[PDB]
Design a protein around this nucleic acid. Sequence first.
DNA 1: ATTATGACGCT
DNA 2: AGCGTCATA
Length: 430
Amino acid sequence: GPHMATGQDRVVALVDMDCFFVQVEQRQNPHLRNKPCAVVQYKSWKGGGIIAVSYEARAFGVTRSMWADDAKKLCPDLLLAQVRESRGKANLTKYREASVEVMEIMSRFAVIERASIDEAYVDLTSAVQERLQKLQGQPISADLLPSTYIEGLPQGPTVQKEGMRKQGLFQWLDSLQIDNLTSPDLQLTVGAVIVEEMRAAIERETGFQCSAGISHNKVLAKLACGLNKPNRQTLVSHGSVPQLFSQMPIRKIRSLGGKLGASVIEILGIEYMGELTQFTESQLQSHFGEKNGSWLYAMCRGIEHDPVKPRQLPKTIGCSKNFPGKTALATREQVQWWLLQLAQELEERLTKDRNDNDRVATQLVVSIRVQGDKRLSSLRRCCALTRYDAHKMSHDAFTVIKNCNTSGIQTEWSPPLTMLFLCATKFSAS
DNA sequence: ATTATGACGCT
DNA sequence: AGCGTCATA
Ligand SMILES: [Mn+2]
Ligand SMILES: [Mn+2]
Ligand SMILES: [Mn+2]
């Protein structure tokens, strides 16, 4: 009754850029705008690998992880932009810098948690309280929510899509009680007003469009964001959760897309998030562990407490390259040459980071994969990172891995290396 | 031969 | 610490 926690205390948004690397390339090159286009890395093997796809191209069935040659079979007029190559490898600097543009704008509205290169969570609870106090009990006009969907509406007693959005929004606003400054539905709505403003600012100041979700926690905000992409935002209320979750595959919820989610489905013999409500907390804990069980018990009721962390900057800076098939590194000087390439990019990014962000990395992590190993990483070793010097870092990385060489002869490297990875970690203020 | 990342959990 | 999981362009 009166003591049932309802996961309504916060207003949280997730803002995610639409087709982000494609938009970055379309801003730069107007010829790519409003076209089926994709961003590709490398070229020689099957046309290169697609890592981002415009919505026009998605209509032809083009997806991420498709080879461009294969994408061209679906979409012959597909336009392509290539990721920059520097020091023999893909270099993602243009996209990291475009990300900073967006993150800095969002940070003007609230403290953000950078969740990926193209998305961040926002805790809007305080901003909403302030806006409410300013509103002075004044109703919220539909004109303040021009790109907002209310999930689950319209419902009850027009065949155009914008038409439908407006009838849902109208039903929502008609029902609101703007008299109560503590009403969660009202708080979400004001949250959505602020996110319209945020998204307008991002588009005005960068040229990039994005989508967003507004809810009471991160998981619902993330889920909401995807419901009406691109260039729209979606409000998922607490009350919308039972219907939403009643047909929502478990794998769609963040963190359940992998083995845990598959185990929830197999062990419990269920398919949809809503079906979890029929298990006790202890039952879920018995199968999935204490933490996962409690998380699932609350999450299937729309409740989650994971805070929006105040962190706008990545806490690691890394450089990685695969050496697939017959390009695997089989000699010492090969291994050393590529460690240097990676280390030179790492030094460049580290030095920029120190100037921009007043911090220094103190640990270097070195990771390799060996031919035959299914695992992403075969071996990970750390050493001290005391100087931003590429030659020292690459020499140090070699030192930590030198014993992995199975060969009797030192000039040869075996079994051949199919991945190298350098990562700088453990930052301290400077 | 999707690749290049990046956060967080376990023991 | 080193490994595993899950995630996103
Ligand atoms: Mn995106
Ligand atoms: Mn994203
Ligand atoms: Mn994506």
